[PDB]
Amino acid sequence: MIRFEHVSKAYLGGRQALQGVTFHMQPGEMAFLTGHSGAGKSTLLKLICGIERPSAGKIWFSGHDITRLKNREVPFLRRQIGMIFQDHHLLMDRTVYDNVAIPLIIAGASGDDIRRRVSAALDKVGLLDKAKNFPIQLSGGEQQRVGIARAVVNKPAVLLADEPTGNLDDALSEGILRLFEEFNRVGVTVLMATHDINLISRRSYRMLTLSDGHLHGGV
Amino acid sequence: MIRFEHVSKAYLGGRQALQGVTFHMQPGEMAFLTGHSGAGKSTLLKLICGIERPSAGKIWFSGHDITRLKNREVPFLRRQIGMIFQDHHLLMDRTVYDNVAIPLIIAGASGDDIRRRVSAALDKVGLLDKAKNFPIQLSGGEQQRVGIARAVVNKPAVLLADEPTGNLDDALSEGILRLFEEFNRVGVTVLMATHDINLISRRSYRMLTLSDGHLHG
Amino acid sequence: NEQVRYAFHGALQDLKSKPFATFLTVMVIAISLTLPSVCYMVYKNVNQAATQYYPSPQITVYLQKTLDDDAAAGVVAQLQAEQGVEKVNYLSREDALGEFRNWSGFGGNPLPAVAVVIPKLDFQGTESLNTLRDRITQINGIDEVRMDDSWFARLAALTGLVGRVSAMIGVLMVAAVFLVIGNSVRLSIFARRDSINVQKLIGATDGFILRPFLYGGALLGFSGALLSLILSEILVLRLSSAVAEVAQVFGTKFDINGLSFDECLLLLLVCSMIGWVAAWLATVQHLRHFTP
Amino acid sequence: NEQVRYAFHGALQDLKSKPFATFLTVMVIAISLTLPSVCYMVYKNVNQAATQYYPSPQITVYLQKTLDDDAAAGVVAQLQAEQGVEKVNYLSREDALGEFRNWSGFGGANPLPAVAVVIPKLDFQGTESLNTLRDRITQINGIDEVRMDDSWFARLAALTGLVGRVSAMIGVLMVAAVFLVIGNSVRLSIFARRDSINVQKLIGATDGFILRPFLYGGALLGFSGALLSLILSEILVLRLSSAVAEVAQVFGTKFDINGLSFDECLLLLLVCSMIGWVAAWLATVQHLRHFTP
Ligand SMILES: Nc1ncnc2c1ncn2[C@@H]1O[C@H](COP(=O)(O)OP(=O)(O)OP(O)(O)=S)[C@@H](O)[C@H]1O
Ligand SMILES: Nc1ncnc2c1ncn2[C@@H]1O[C@H](COP(=O)(O)OP(=O)(O)OP(O)(O)=S)[C@@H](O)[C@H]1O
Predict the structure, then answer these.
(1) Residue B71: which of C6, C10, C291 has the nearest Cβ?
(2) Mutation test of the interface with chain D: which of C37, C150, C164, C187, choosing the one with the most D Cβ atoms within 10 A?
(3) Taken in order B18, B21, B24, B28, is the CA torsion positive or negative?
(4) Strand B2-3 and strand B64-65: pairing?
(5) For site-directed labelling of D59, which of A135, C48, C148, D79 has its Cα 20 to 30 A away?
(6) In whole angstroms, what is the distance from residue C205 CA to residue B78 CA?
(7) What range(s) does the ABC transporter domain occupy (chain B)?
């Protein structure tokens, strides 16, 4: 289970991103959280991995308390989260083949498993052609595709999707959605975040709308 | 007057992103060029400003041809295109107010009308309270907004668009599109390149589609 | 001088954005510039000491046995007339009588006089010694024009090796200042990858990219030279205090010449120009990689 | 050693990424190591050049007349067992010192006593040796010429202290210079990247894992830094070994310049690579402390 207490966060600039968010995030099923441009629809996902501290309340994950971790276990517990970014961050001047093999190195992979893990990860996105090149010559669609491809590896317990398909067409939007949708037979929680409604209106899962850090609607 | 004939692109690996395209582009008229994910639309989109050479063929701009010319001529005519990008090429060290003042100080305007020009280029975008700060604490929903805020400065003769509304709501997409629509009252072209189909279905303009970098879908 | 305001404005906050690195990159580069100043201090105070203190190339010249009791005055008068030796110490026959009696009592009679020959530094070479031996021998009344050498052979040989090794060290330090300026400036430039791309994709002029990096390199070299001068002056004062107790056994007052004003301006201008060319070479060889 | 192969592979990929930039970094870190080596061999060769020098510390050991040579051998054994640093030579006054009487019978014109010169080693010197030696000196008969010479003895004590202080100051500023130049080079080398530290921690990793290819990179930069100086110092030595020949023959002997033996070469490589183990370790953790929440 993933539980929220009455939590909020602001910053040093005086901008209050969150003003009280509370939900029980059950293991297994999906989420389609959305809001306006000024809403905290990305900073909500930033608190899950624990790379910012919440200004108010206390934060809970799995079966432990992830509040007040002194930089010695929040390296350890973050590894099971494939937290996707809004804007792409790749290891520059470094090939794609070991770019998606980054989380396998820390987890203690063998020699043989890396090849089939990278191959099976890039099969689900369909990019076994630009595999040995650099992300300089990758255009933005496949840059987003290799950014979302490295969340798939290591088989994470919790998956976060901070705006995928922002740089994709509608034909591949259904495929990159169904790459998430095939994860329902395994015990993983997926937090999909988006702006558009058209593919959301074609499906039916949980709505978590927020307005300036207040959910109001959405249990 | 932007004239095209058969132009191709094979950078290093022989990947034929483009092979040839032919269309005239009238001054002041809008366009909504699009393709699929692997379709070579952004390379064609950068061929108008021409930060890379177009290999085979030639591109005509206004009343000149810029195909393989010197580096003392290309950045002088690069000031008349509205360069926005998909990735956020913004000065991380400097604050937002002089991110959009780069075409002003290139144009050499006086210091007194910098503030009213920047505020005139940011009120229609809707970012004045979130100015005079750094882009690292700005999210992408306003980072893409301050990215295009330097394109609307000083009224360029031709305005360029490399996938806006990537991190924006549909209401903000409509607002930013009406921001782009009022430029068509004067003689500046709009070259929108979006993957959204419902936004372009709500209005009728010059719709062309390139399919895998060849011809016209 | 109005469009250049922004280029000087941006570099100041660029350096003041991360202050510890700005302090470290000047503290590492002033102490690399400490050593040419230190070697220049060591060079120029022993050179003025070499005019009077250690070298005295005297050649022991003996006169005729009992030619005259005051025959050395004629030798002084004739040797005043030619080049080479100008000032001759007056040592007559009666001078040798008073100068040779004390040596006999220290160890335990025609007695020809001993002349003093000083060829200065323009005829101090051993090949040029035989030219001076021609004019002394051809003057009558002089019997022994006997060589000394030995210590003078060492004085005319080790100075070449010391000058050669000092020239080698000076060439290695002028290469060091030619290279560490360029290294520091090019790492400062290569720390910034986004800015050149943004101001080049946006329509501009190449000089507009060139100016703030060039001014930052110039002020970095200026700060390095200034901190080098301030750090060298206190070491000159410390060595003056260190030589104050050593100079009092030499019998004369001695002081160390400090960094003069006519060369500190040259050091500051060459540091500014080397920052200029280091930023030119760092920036021009970086924005040619952004034009396909 | 299976987990550290990625560190070596990443380090050699970083070094081979920009060969000109890494070569220039190796050159700037290697030109700094030239002068500790040059000053070390300069300080080293003058130790064996202190075996012989022009201002020899002569001691006036002018004994008595005629019968002093019989008592010279009796008294030399007592003084050598007093301090332990005592070298006395003796010559025949009537026969071997007749040339010294004939020195006054030269162009620059047995009453004189015998001449003996005592030159001790540099280990037992100073005013304490004079205080422990003048108490029992001139213990036989009366001994003429008690007037010592100490004008050169006082100046050599003053001159060696001055250049000793200069050399100590130079050495501590060289170790400061090499420490700060490896700190500057490694700090700008890791500051040249920003995303490579961020992305390694935004994806869950181990804090020690990101330290591996930066500590190893700094250690390999320090290890490769000293080797170029150790193939450049001896080049300057052999370039300046030619001038040793004509200044050795005027000394009346043959002198050989020493070189960098393998005992101190490993020490220099260890001290130049160990500061890459420290500078990268402090600079990376200083850089990632600014990115923690
Ligand atoms: N690190 C930060 N420091 C200060 N303010 C921030 C920070 N991150 C976000 N904000 C502000 O919080 C508000 C929205 O936060 P975000 O969740 O980051 O935005 P968002 O969810 O990315 O919305 P988008 O970009 O349209 S998907 C804006 O007013 C931002 O300026
Ligand atoms: N510098 C480059 N070198 C090699 N191939 C490139 C380069 N830039 C783009 N491409 C290729 O161009 C093709 C697609 O071009 P784009 O027009 O950029 O695609 P796209 O539809 O615009 O995707 P985005 O996300 O909208 S940019 C891909 O096959 C890329 O590999």
Answers:
(1) C291
(2) C187
(3) negative
(4) unpaired
(5) C148
(6) 10
(7) 2-217
Handedness of CA C15, C21, C23, C26 (dihedral sign): negative
Output DSSP code: residue A207: -
Dihedral of CA atoms D200, C287, C29, C27 in degrees, nearest 10, equals -50
Residue A172 has what DSSP assignment?
A: H
Count other Cβ atoms within 10 Å, centred on residue A61: 21
Resolution of this structure in Å: 3.7
Q: What domains, with CATH codes, occur in chain D?
A: 5-53+160-289 (no CATH), 59-148 (3.30.70)
Asked if the C-beta of D251 comes within 8 angstroms of chain C's C-beta atoms, the answer is yes
Q: Which amino acid is at A144?
A: Q
The neighbour count for residue D214, using CB atoms within 10 Å, is: 25
Tell me the C-alpha distance between A51 and A172, whole Å.
31
Nearest-10 crossing angle of helices B140-148, B170-181: 0
What are the pocket residues of ligand 2 if the criterion is a CB atom closer than 6 Å to any ligand atom?
A: A 137, 139-141, 167; B 11, 15, 17, 35, 37-43, 86, 163
| Tokens read off for D62 | 């002018």
A15 C-alpha vs ligand 1 centroid, how far in Å? 9
Distance CA C231, CA C16 (A): 22
Q: Which residues contact residue C55 at a Cβ distance below 8 angstroms, ignoring those fewer than 6 apart?
A: C121, C124, C155
Kindly report the CA angle at D118 between D112 and D121, in degrees rounded to 5?
Answer: 165
Q: Helix (H, G, I), strand (E, B), or coil: what is residue A203?
A: coil
Token pair belonging to B148: 């295009």
Between helix A112-125 and helix A170-181 the angle, nearest 10°, is 130
Flag whether residue A88 sits within 8 Å of chain D, measured between CB atoms.
Answer: no
CB contact under 8 A, C202 and B105: no
Mutate to test the pocket of ligand 1, among B134, B139, B176 (most ligand atoms within 8 A of CB): B139
| A50 in contact with chain D, both atoms CB, cutoff 8 A | yes
Structure-determination approach: cryo-EM
A13-48 CB burial, b ≥16 within 10 A, e <16: eeeebbbebebebeeeebbbbbbbbbbbbbbbbbbb
Among B8, B12, B15, B162, say which to mutate for ligand 2: greatest number of ligand atoms within 8 Å of CB.
B15
Task: Calculate the alpha carbon distances from B96 to A216, B91, B92, B138, D21 in Å.
Answer: 33, 8, 9, 10, 33
Q: Which residues of B are annotated as a binding site?
A: 35-42
Nearest-by-CA chain A residue for B131:
A13
Q: Say how many Å lie between the first and final Cα of chain D, rounded.
A: 33
| Residue D184: φ, ψ to 5° | -65, -45
Q: Does domain A2-210 have CATH number 3.40.50.300?
A: yes
Q: How far is CA A132 from CA A93, A96, C78, D194, D280, in A?
A: 12, 6, 93, 23, 30
Helix orientation angle between C206-244 and D151-191, rounded to the nearest 10 degrees: 160
Residues across chain C: 292
- CA of D92: how far to CAs of C93, D59, D69, D139, D144, in Å? 36, 18, 7, 21, 17
